[PDB]
Amino acid sequence: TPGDENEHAHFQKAKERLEAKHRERMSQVMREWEEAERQAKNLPKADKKAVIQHFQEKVESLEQEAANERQQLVETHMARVEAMLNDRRRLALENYITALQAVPPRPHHVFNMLKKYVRAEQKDRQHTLKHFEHVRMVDPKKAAQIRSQVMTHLRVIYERMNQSLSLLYNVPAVAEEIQDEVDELLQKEQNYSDDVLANMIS
Amino acid sequence: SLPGTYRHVDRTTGQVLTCDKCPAGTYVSEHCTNMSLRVCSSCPAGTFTRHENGIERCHDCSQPCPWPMIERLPCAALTDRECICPPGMYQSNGTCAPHTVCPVGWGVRKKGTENEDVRCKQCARGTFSDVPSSVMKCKAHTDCLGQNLEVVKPGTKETDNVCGMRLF
Ligand SMILES: *[C@@H]1O[C@H](CO)[C@@H](O)[C@H](O)[C@H]1NC(C)=O
Ligand SMILES: *[C@@H]1O[C@H](CO)[C@@H](O)[C@H](O)[C@H]1NC(C)=O
């Protein structure tokens, strides 16, 4: 998908900018450290040691600023990808529903749209998981904090899906027409959802 | 162990010392001893150190840029030289390859970089490319009605609409 490759490209470009900026700052600090040790070379040992401590503090500080800024980039990318996916989910849902209000209903069609809307909901959920996974990796304590929120979102995805199914259960002829293809779709879906909760608790 | 330090075994006394690292652009010319801090010296010409370090020799710079690559970054105390492909080419294998030209009927879909070839796509219905180019995108058919003319020959992927007037 062009939206996929494009979003990853903007994220990529942001990362490169950010690293260029950090590299320049670091480079400036390392030059100053070297010049300072040169200035202090005839001072007592404890004073040379203080020069070193000073600049290892500057370096540590820069490194944490940079780590922080990287997480911000990641957050911005995740939000954007979420918007893209929310869109696609809403589009699949509308198409499936107009397929379901079409008269006469063509179950071929309906099940195909149902297919893609379930895939959209799934890819939404996957993104949610991947975001949480990243948080857990880089910052397990935050992840422990937001877990509840993720679970409640997952419950929303469920409810929305269920209602979406109920609509099919409204128009019984079509439903019975395609019921076992629907049953297998829900089969592997149930597997996916299970996989997701598994990846969640650990 | 702590990240501003490195471990060093005194070569005579055999004592296990914790030395301080030296800054990037610098290498350890004298290890710390029992009595003394490590001493740092500047990377000599043609070498570099990218990071804070405890090593005894600076890294040799990369070879000078092989034709037709150009140098965006010179060899310096804190940086290896950086070689990249000239405009209109990209890194392929270990050299430079010309960007793919999108022929007639095709337009650029993903622009070409120094690391990545151009990606082409077939002009979609309603547009066209009548030129082979590694940079041009697809262009929409001329709107003939929009300047009070008729479509006398429908455009394709490769050709514009032909506008005209007709008598009967
Ligand atoms: C899901 O929605 C449908 C329609 O309301 C209903 O049949 C079913 O009871 C609901 N199930 C849950 C758990 O919400
Ligand atoms: C050498 O190291 C010992 C500990 O191993 C230390 O106590 C002493 O002050 C150092 N300097 C000397 C012996 O001149």
Ligand SMILES: [Mg+2]
């Ligand atoms: Mg072309």
